[PDB]
């Protein structure tokens, strides 16, 4: 059982990385990647990558870096997710507005731009002095 290190990185950082026996991803058109596969670059699909170690990753967009000793899965969005894809959307959901809910970001600065203009209200200098 020779192994091929497999990595999955996103714009938010590594997701899944460990040595397995094979990676099977669905390229646009299946492709089994086995240790010793030649250098090949191919665009993924919105599908899941099955990493088979004992036996049995959700990816949205991105390529495949196939190196004889390693497999890199670039993904715009990837979440260890079930068979179903209509989850990575679920995560793309519960994260969406829960990032908009970050008004606090805005609102503290308001309260700050507030204080800064209330200590300046007393015209912290009246004709100097």
């Amino acid at each position: 059982m020779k192994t091929i290190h497999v990595s999955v990185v996103t714009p938010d950082g590594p997701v899944y990385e460990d040595d397995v026996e094979m990676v099977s991803v669905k390229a646009k058109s299946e492709l089994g990647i086995l240790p010793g596969h030649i250098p090949l670059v191919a665009p993924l699909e919105i599908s899941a990558a099955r990493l088979k170690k004992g036996g049995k990753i959700a990816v949205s967009g991105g390529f495949l870096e196939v190196r004889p000793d390693k497999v890199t899965i670039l993904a715009q969005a990837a979440e260890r997710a079930e068979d179903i894809d209509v989850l990575r959307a679920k995560a793309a959901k519960e994260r969406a507005e829960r990032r908009l809910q970050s008004q606090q970001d805005d609102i503290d600065f308001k309260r700050a731009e507030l204080a800064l203009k209330r200590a300046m209200n007393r015209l912290s200098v009246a004709e100097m002095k």
Binding site: S7, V9, T10, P11, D12, G13, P14, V41, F63, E65, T72, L74, A112, A115, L116, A119, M120, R122, S124, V125, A126, E127, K129
Partner: protein, 57 residues
């Protein structure tokens, strides 16, 4: 010339201003050393793009 209790109003005003200021400096210093965290976390993806974008002859 001028006041006294009008000179206190200015001090304290300035003080509470420095407070609010230095607050945010530290606060925005806390948001530099989280820029790496999402800067790092993007280091790999970039590497493994130009490595792909090696460019066919």
């Amino acid at each position: 010339m001028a006041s006294l209790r009008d000179i206190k109003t200015r001090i304290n005003a300035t003080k509470k201003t420095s407070q609010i200021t230095k607050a945010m400096e530290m606060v925005s210093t806390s948001k530099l050393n989280r820029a790496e965290q999402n800067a790092k976390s993007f280091v790999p993806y970039m590497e493994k793009i130009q490595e792909v974008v090696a460019n066919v002859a």
